[PDB]
Amino acid sequence: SANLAATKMSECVLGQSKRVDFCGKGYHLMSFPQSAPHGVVFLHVTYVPAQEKNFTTAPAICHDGKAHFPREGVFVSNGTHWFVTQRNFYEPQIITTDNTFVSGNCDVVIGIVNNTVYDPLQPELDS
Amino acid sequence: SANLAATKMSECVLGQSKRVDFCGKGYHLMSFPQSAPHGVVFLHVTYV
Amino acid sequence: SALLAGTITSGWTFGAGAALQIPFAMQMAYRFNGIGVTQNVLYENQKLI
Numbered sequence: 111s112a113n114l115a116a117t118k119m120s121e122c123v124l125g126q127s128k129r130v131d132f133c134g135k136g137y138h139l140m141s142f143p144q145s146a147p148h149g150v151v152f153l154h155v156t157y158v159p160a161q162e163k164n165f166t167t168a169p170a171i172c173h174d175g176k177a178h179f180p181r182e183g184v185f186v187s188n189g190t191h192w193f194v195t196q197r198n199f200y201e202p203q204i205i206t207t208d209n210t211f212v213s214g215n216c217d218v219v220i221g222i223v224n225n226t227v228y229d230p231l232q233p234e235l236d237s
Numbered sequence: 238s239a240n241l242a243a244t245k246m247s248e249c250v251l252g253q254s255k256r257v258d259f260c261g262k263g264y265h266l267m268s269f270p271q272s273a274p275h276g277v278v279f280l281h282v283t284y285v
Numbered sequence: 286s287a288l289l290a291g292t293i294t295s296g297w298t299f300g301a302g303a304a305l306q307i308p309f310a311m312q313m314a315y316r317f318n319g320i321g322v323t324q325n326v327l328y329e330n331q332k333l334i
Binding site for chain 1: 297298300301302304305308310311312314315323324325328329331
């Protein structure tokens with residue numbers, strides 16, 4: 111138990127650890143050691159998400175005939191427009207070419223949907 | 238052996254690990270636990 | 286079989302909190318990103334897997 115105690119003093123307290131159900135339940139932030147008789151009382155500060163909402167997804171976006179794959183993020187929709195958000199929180203963004211990755215065609219992707227990828231360089235030519 | 242088993246239920250099954258020769262040989266994808274008498278049988282899906 | 290349920294269906298978030306709704310085609314795209322593989326390998330080769 112002391113080798114498991116000195117592991118959590120090294121890994122959880124002194125730095126950030128990605129481990130699940132080791133540094134405490136959920137996503138690990140930090141750890142506060144507290145001294146006790148014959149042991150150390152751990153205080154595990156964790157990141158727990160709470161309120162969720164169901165969205166409409168799709169793996170890829172077809173525009174010009176080439177499939178647009180997401181770089182970092184997910185594809186969600188409220189039923190009208192497709193948004194680019196993240197797995198841990200809801201931050202809707204305008205779909206841009208910097209947030210998408212162009213690979214392959216639209217035929218080989220199962221579940222691909224059609225939308226218009228906004229290019230920011232196109233209004234900046236005449237303005 | 239049970240504390241090694243309770244770690245691999247937490248790390249390999251419930252999460253994703255970057256480790257070599259912990260969740261199985263090669264790059265880790267996912268892990269499937271199975272019931273066993275007096276123990277547990279792991280199914281390690283690996284990327285080779 | 287309850288943990289075989291939420292690993293295949295509900296994702297990696299069932300033990301870290303409340304269970305999300307994650308489709309299975311979106312699970313392995315983000316499970317390749319930990320080992321350094323992007324999403325080009327999964328969607329094209331999905332019939333070969």
